[PDB]
Ligand binder design. Sequence first.
Ligand SMILES: CSC[C@H](NC(=O)COc1cccc2cnccc12)C(=O)N[C@@H](Cc1ccccc1)[C@H](O)C(=O)N1CSC[C@H]1C(=O)NC(C)(C)C
Lengths: 99, 99
Amino acid sequence: PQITLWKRPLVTIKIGGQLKEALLDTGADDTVIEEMSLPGRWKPKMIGGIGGFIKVRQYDQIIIEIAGHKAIGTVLVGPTPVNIIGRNLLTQIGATLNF
Amino acid sequence: PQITLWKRPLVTIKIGGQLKEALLDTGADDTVIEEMSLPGRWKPKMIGGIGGFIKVRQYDQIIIEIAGHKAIGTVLVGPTPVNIIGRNLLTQIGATLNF
Ligand SMILES: CSC[C@H](NC(=O)COc1cccc2cnccc12)C(=O)N[C@@H](Cc1ccccc1)[C@H](O)C(=O)N1CSC[C@H]1C(=O)NC(C)(C)C
């Protein structure tokens, strides 16, 4: 698809068998999702944004479907205001910005 | 241009006579620039993201040249660590996300 930006670029993701909504976010290096249970061991990470730094849980090699495209990679879990698909997974689906 | 997302999508912008580097950010509703002086009347606003909220000054009808393309819109000024070009100005330069 070709997504214009007059509205937020919200898509449906499937993770852990659940459907969720998430934003395609070119300003985010990483992918961060709201609190949920994921399989496996996690590692600690600090990420920062507009209002400061938050601690999150890093899970690796997680299967996630983004608007119907399968991606496998790192997902962070923490207290984020919105589910964010960042550039680590946007590169896996082949997304580009065009103007 | 077509901009791949292996790296942060940073471009040069010109605002208020000054050249600055800024991030093209499809996750941002608003455009937020580091503290600088701009002409005109402003109103205070709070904006939130990862980490919480910050206070900014809202300037209306500002002209910004984004990688050589002129756009006009609302610009928020305040203590951001990175200059952010959000959807309110990305629309005006005809930016789309494609996959
Ligand atoms: C994975 S979530 C963390 C993400 N941060 C980043 O990828 C990179 O951060 C940084 C890069 C370089 C220097 C930095 C210094 N101090 C803090 C963060 C920094 C982030 O919050 N990115 C956001 C943009 C941004 C990048 C760098 C600094 C600050 C903000 C995001 O694209 C967005 O637009 N979001 C995510 S939450 C809502 C919305 C957002 O903040 N909206 C505004 C800007 C408040 C309107």
